[PDB]
């Protein structure tokens, strides 16, 4: 379940990191990257992940369905957005709001993608 | 329908606005009545000596019912029977002061520690300038100050003591409910005396600071307070 494996994963995983009186986490669908109950992506039934495009430009969005939970093959779903700056943030505010799908992760799933759009700019 | 539920919430906001108004007329009237009773209690202790000098007799006033007890000496080198007393008046540091009502059963207790205290009989002003300035409460074994009447009216509502000026009428004229407003007051934290004491050890008679000093203790509260 969920609270069972948080009581298991919270200290002896391998995606976990400890140095300089700090704590981070390298999960494949995490944001803010830090070990907490709400930002882990392997436990819940519903998970949000925001990644850079495999090409040079764009932002992919890894969702997760509910039907096939134990089938890691077709459990997630990837979409790709390669547009301007406003409507991408609107289509993420809509993906997380108007489906009532895990609404806690909205502002951080906008901040991280406004940092990918800041990132993929041609540097001066 | 969410047309009526708004007005129903506004009734509860107006009923308490009227309850603060009918508590702010009450504290003002309970104060004005006392301001009349303190004139009457000071003048009538003069008038019996003017009529007793018209004839040629004498007017002895009654012995007062309130003393103010300050510790002056330290924690080191203390007699064990003494230290129990100074922990039955709740005087733990140096320079702590309390208010003690008087009787035969508490003069003989305040006699055995004459070398460590300097007690007196306070005036009306130096009760104001100890409640308003250095007066902290005791709420749940803590030390919470006094910035409102509602901090008194929680722990003293069962004695018709709903403000500060009733607690002062109780202390000055010692009412029935003195214990429940003197265990409540945390012990005071006075400062060091300005100018300087004469000599700490000896009695006030031979030029010291200890012992009785019946109305010179307001010359040690205007100095220390």
């Amino acid at each position: 379940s969920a609270h069972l494996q948080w009581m298991v994963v919270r200290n002896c995983s391998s995606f976990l990191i400890k140095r300089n009186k700090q704590t981070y986490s390298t999960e494949p669908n995490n944001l803010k990257a830090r070990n907490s109950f709400r930002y882990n992506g392997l436990i819940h039934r519903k998970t949000v992940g925001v990644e850079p495009a495999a090409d040079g430009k764009g932002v992919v969005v890894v969702m997760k369905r509910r039907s096939g939970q134990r089938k890691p093959a077709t459990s997630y779903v990837r979409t790709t957005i390669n547009k301007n700056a406003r409507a991408t943030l609107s289509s993420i505010r809509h993906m997380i709001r108007k489906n009532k799908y895990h609404p806690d992760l909205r502002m951080a799933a906008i901040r991280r993608a406004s940092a990918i759009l800041r990132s993929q700019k041609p540097v001066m | 329908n969410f047309a009526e539920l708004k007005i129903k919430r506004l009734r509860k906001k107006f009923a308490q606005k009227m309850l603060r108004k009918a508590r702010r007329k009450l504290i003002y009237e309970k104060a004005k009545h006392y301001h009349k009773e303190y004139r009457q209690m000071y003048r009538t202790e003069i008038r019996m000596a003017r009529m007793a000098r018209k004839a040629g007799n004498f007017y002895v006033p009654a012995e007062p019912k309130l003393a103010f007890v300050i510790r002056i000496r330290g924690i080191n080198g203390v007699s064990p029977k003494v230290r129990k007393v100074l922990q039955l008046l709740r005087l733990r540091q140096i320079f702590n002061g309390t208010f003690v009502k008087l009787n035969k059963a508490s003069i003989n207790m305040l006699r055995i520690v004459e070398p460590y205290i300097a007690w007196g009989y306070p005036n009306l002003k130096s009760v104001n300038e100890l409640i308003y300035k250095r007066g902290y409460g005791k709420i749940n074994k803590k030390r919470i100050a006094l910035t409102d009447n509602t901090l008194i009216a929680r722990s003293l509502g069962k004695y018709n003591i709903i403000c500060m000026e009733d607690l002062i009428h109780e202390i000055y004229t010692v009412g029935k409910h003195f214990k429940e407003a003197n265990n409540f007051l945390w012990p005071f934290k006075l400062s060091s005396p300005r100018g300087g004491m004469k000599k700490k050890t000896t009695h006030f008679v031979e030029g010291g600071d200890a012992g009785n000093r019946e109305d010179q203790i307001n010359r040690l509260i205007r100095r220390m307070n």
Partner: protein
Amino acid sequence: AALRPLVKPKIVKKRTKKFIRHQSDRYVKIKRNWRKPRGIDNRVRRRFKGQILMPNIGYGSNKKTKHMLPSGFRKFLVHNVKELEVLLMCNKSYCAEIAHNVSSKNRKAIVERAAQLAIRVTNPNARL
């Protein structure tokens, strides 16, 4: 002219020197590390006047300005490129400090990647 921290608080500290072991300079076999002296004749443990002070806990620092560099950044220790994806969200508070054994053909590709993400690196011109 740099990467500005988020907020720049006034760092105050309660002691700026070190602690040295008692009778450290008369000998060489005494190191300058701290060892609480446990005699009975002694002057330090019983706090005489004008001697070497001791390390109590009162010299501790405020939890808001603890571990803070003078520039206003905290530190973090990085080996490869893969751990800088950690800091693309926590950016304006913590800084990276590249390890020692990393050779000089990789720092060319780490610092460039750590200029897109707008992450401060404490030692960017290490080897050349």
